[PDB]
Amino acid sequence: DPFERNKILGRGINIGNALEAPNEGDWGVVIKDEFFDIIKEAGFSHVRIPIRWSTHAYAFPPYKIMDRFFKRVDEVINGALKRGLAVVINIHHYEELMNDPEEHKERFLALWKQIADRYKDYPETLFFEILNEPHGNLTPEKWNELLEEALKVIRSIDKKHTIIIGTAEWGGISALEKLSVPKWEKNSIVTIHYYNPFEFTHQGAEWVEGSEKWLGRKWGSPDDQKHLIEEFNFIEEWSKKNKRPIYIGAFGAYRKADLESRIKWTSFVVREMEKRRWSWAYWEFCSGFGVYDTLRKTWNKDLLEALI
């Protein structure tokens, strides 16, 4: 039952700027095995692991995933399962697929055939997230077609694991009403990433064009709160109407935002998601949006309190 699987996910955290970089560590984070003890002890139920499989698979048929990398992902998944954490794995940063979905469709499906084959007998606490933030030439209508093709591939191999399906137009709420999950699939959770107000969460983010113009933006007024509730109500009404559980798989404010606003925004988002019984995963553990200092081995106490 996917709603029971959503309850199993519960509170989570992304270990980002790690396996979704071109190579692990390039973006600042290597997934240490002790991180799983740290995260479980703090109270989280699961970890979300962004993975850029596309740079670790051949470009020509059968698009085989490279041995060393598969072994590494196995090591990470098993490290998390050892502590009783549920685990979400995905395909992240496959830009070629977004820019030309027609050319990369079969390669994308070969990746899922291999990933489902690899993990089909792993525990039910492992979840498969089809694709992080479809966007660009992978339009909402093309994503509805591609996600159904992925579901068919995965289900041809594995009818046990819950699958997580995102929205197009970069994975937020804008294309939620356009999302179509096939009626025949009954064990999926829909995921939405929530970073609104984007100008607040992303102020000064170096990889976002013109974000410097947002530096200093605050968050916390009664009107800021009402706007966010309006958006969460929209998502909740969609969930109720379409009978699909919701997972906010990524949300967080960048370190350049003032700490007090980050705490208020993060704490309010978590209280409001929990009132709607949604599962979620904070973005992210220890990098630019981080809440844990790997050198001092300490959590930012106020941001951790906002989460747990």
Ligand SMILES: OC[C@H]1O[C@@H](O[C@H]2[C@H](O)[C@H](O)[C@H](O[C@H]3[C@H](O)[C@H](O)[C@@H](O)O[C@@H]3CO)O[C@@H]2CO)[C@@H](O)[C@@H](O)[C@@H]1O
């Ligand atoms: O850290 C250095 C490294 O940063 C690269 O930019 C990345 C950011 O650091 C974050 O990792 C960012 O995370 C996004 C996720 O991938 C999802 O889209 C979503 O959850 O939102 C978060 C937050 O925006 O991703 C960017 C890359 O897109 C990049 O600049 C790299 O060259 C640099 O070395």
